[PDB]
């Protein structure tokens, strides 16, 4: 299962009662875990810090994460670039840009397991298609990824898929193995 993408569909909860929030909840403080929430946040400071804070700096990893998360064009436009200060005292970002800063912060952290709880929810069909493909598919291709989704296109591209029911019931397999089940 190491280095694979598990797409979780079905009854996976919503908001602060999502299945992943619970789990991460029950785990509240044995390998490293990087969690990406459904709702994006920033803390006052630079764009760079909002992505790399707390993790050791790698020039190659930082720049690749920005490229894959579609932040290269956004950042370039700002006069200060990635040294642009965020918040009430600085620049105010759009939901889409902040969603991308949130994903980059999770993707940049070196961890043994990545738990992405619907991080494309507030992104457009075009932005999501590109980020899913260049970030979770290509960039994170050698990482153990657990992506909560609800998009049939994300189940088609995952190594293994998991469909949850409200009850104890569930399907664990591939998208093709699911298609052959009661076609």
């Amino acid at each position, epitope marked *: 299962e190491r280095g694979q993408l598990l797409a979780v*569909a*079905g009854s996976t909860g*919503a*908001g602060k009662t999502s299945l992943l929030m619970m789990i991460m909840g029950e785990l509240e403080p044995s390998g490293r875990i990087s969690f990406c929430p459904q709702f994006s946040w920033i803390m006052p400071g630079t764009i760079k810090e909002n992505i790399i804070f707390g993790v050791s700096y790698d020039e190659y990893r930082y720049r690749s994460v920005i490229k894959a998360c579609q932040l290269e064009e956004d950042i370039s436009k700002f006069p200060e670039k990635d040294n642009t200060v965020l918040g009430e005292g600085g620049i105010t970002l*759009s*939901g*889409g840009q902040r969603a991308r800063i949130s994903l980059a912060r999770a993707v940049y952290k070196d961890a043994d397991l990545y738990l992405l709880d619907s991080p494309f*929810g*507030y*992104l*457009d*069909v*075009l*932005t999501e298609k590109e980020i899913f493909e260049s970030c979770v598919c290509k960039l994170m291709a050698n990482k153990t990824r657990i992506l909560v*989704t*609800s*998009k*049939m*296109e*994300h*189940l088609k591209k995952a190594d293994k898929i998991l*469909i*949850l029911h409200e009850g104890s019931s569930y399907f664990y397999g591939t998208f093709s193995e699911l298609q052959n089940l009661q076609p």
Partner: nanobody
Amino acid sequence: QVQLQESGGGLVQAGGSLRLSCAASGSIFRIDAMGWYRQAPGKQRELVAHSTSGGSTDYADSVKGRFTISRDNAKNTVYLQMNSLKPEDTAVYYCNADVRTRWYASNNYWGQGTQVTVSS
């Protein structure tokens, strides 16, 4: 099985309002994300507005304050109330939706697209 049909387009003299609509027809279960994307000739398909199931609305800087995205779950339709239309807005408006034909996950559907033209 899903088909996305639009209406509410046409010609409006600059500064006037126009309300677009887009209903979903098929074996639907529920609708998750609905949005309006436009494409003027000599340009690529781009975002106008993005609505989620949980009533979250996002707008492209270009249409902010003028356009409003709304939806009726019961009528299974997404609306775009566009106000104070300027000539740059003129383009073809595409309704886009994530529609669940199967309870657990959705499929992406684009509309045929209606022409919104601007007079004077």
